[PDB]
Amino acid sequence: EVNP
Amino acid sequence: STTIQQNKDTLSQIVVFPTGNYDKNEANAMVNRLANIDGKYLNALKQNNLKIKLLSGKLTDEKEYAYLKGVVPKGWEGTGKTWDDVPGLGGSTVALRIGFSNKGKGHDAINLELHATAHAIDHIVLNDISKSAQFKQIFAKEGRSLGNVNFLGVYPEEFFAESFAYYYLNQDTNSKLKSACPQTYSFLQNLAK
Ligand SMILES: [Zn+2]
C-alpha cells in the first residue's frame, strides 16, 4: 500500500 | 533523554540514507523528529524490517516507485499532478524527500515524515486500524476538524496519519489536536499504552  | 536516545538507536536500524550528495543536517533533523514517536511503534517497525528511505530526488526516480510515474495519488485528483510531484509516501514502505518536511513544501501535512510513518504504523503495525469500525466512528465526528476536508475529511487513513503527526510532532501540535479532536486524541493516547 501507498498513501500521499 | 535516555528514551529519545533509545528511539534514535532504533531509528538507526530503520532509516536508510540516500547514496550520493544530500543534506545531512536536514536528514538528521528528520530522524530527530521521528524519534519523538513512541518507542513501541518504532520497535515494531524495526521488527517488521520497515525502512524509512530518505531521498534527495523525486520518489518516482527510485526503481521501486517508477511504476507510479503518471499515477494520480488518492486525494490528488484534479490537481494536474501525479506521484512524480509528491514528496512523501507511506504504507507498506516509507519514502521521503529531504527538505520537504514542512507544510506547504509540495504537500499539506504538518510534518512529512511523521505523516508518512504514521501510514506505515497504521498498515504494518496496527493492521489498518484507521479503517476499523471504532476509528470510522471517530472520523465521522472529528475527521474535518483539522481542515483539508476534501482529503483528511474523506479518507480515514489520512485523518489517522495527520492526527498521529500532530500527536507526536511537538507540544503545540499535540495540544492543538487535543482541543480540536478530543476523541481522536484519547484514541491515540490509549493506542500507545
Ligand atoms: Zn497520507
Side-chain angles (χ1 to χ4, degrees), chain A, chain B residues 2-193:
Chain A
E1 108 167 15
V2 302
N3 300 274
Chain B
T2 54
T3 300
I4 289 162
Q5 187 56 53
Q6 288 175 326
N7 286 359
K8 289 188 194 182
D9 294 342
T10 301
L11 285 159
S12 73
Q13 305 313 303
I14 293 165
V15 175
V16 178
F17 298 95
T19 62
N21 292 129
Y22 66 93
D23 183 342
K24 297 185 307 304
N25 291 342
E26 183 60 15
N28 182 65
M30 294 170 81
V31 172
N32 285 342
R33 289 183 287 263
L34 287 166
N36 286 342
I37 296 171
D38 193 290
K40 89 164 179 188
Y41 300 129
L42 298 177
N43 295 335
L45 292 175
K46 173 176 137 190
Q47 174 64 28
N48 282 274
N49 210 37
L50 181 280
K51 305 306 174 182
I52 293 172
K53 297 171 291 203
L54 303 183
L55 305 178
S56 57
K58 294 180 180 178
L59 273 52
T60 51
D61 289 333
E62 300 300 305
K63 299 296 189 58
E64 68 267 31
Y65 300 117
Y67 78 96
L68 293 170
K69 290 183 177 182
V71 175
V72 181
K74 175 200 78 207
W76 281 54
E77 298 81 7
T79 68
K81 292 187 281 182
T82 58
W83 269 107
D84 307 75
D85 307 303
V86 176
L89 176 157
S92 293
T93 60
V94 175
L96 299 163
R97 291 200 67 178
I98 297 165
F100 293 71
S101 283
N102 285 337
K103 184 187 284 184
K105 296 290 178 60
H107 70 98
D108 291 325
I110 193 73
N111 175 267
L112 188 81
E113 60 274 17
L114 288 170
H115 179 105
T117 301
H119 282 303
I121 294 167
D122 179 28
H123 183 63
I124 299 173
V125 176
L126 302 175
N127 317 128
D128 300 314
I129 196 165
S130 69
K131 292 131 171 172
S132 70
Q134 181 190 13
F135 196 73
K136 287 189 180 303
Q137 293 175 340
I138 292 168
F139 163 79
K141 183 178 186 63
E142 303 192 339
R144 300 154 310 286
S145 294
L146 300 178
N148 202 3
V149 302
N150 289 335
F151 184 71
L152 300 184
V154 172
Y155 306 103
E157 69 277 13
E158 297 299 335
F159 178 66
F160 176 89
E162 190 70 3
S163 293
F164 192 96
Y166 271 74
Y167 192 94
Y168 288 108
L169 181 61
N170 61 51
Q171 174 270 330
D172 187 66
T173 63
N174 179 277
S175 290
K176 287 179 158 77
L177 183 70
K178 186 177 186 181
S179 170
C181 307
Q183 296 195 35
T184 303
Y185 188 93
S186 177
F187 174 84
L188 291 172
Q189 199 167 34
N190 295 337
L191 258 192
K193 281 177 179 62

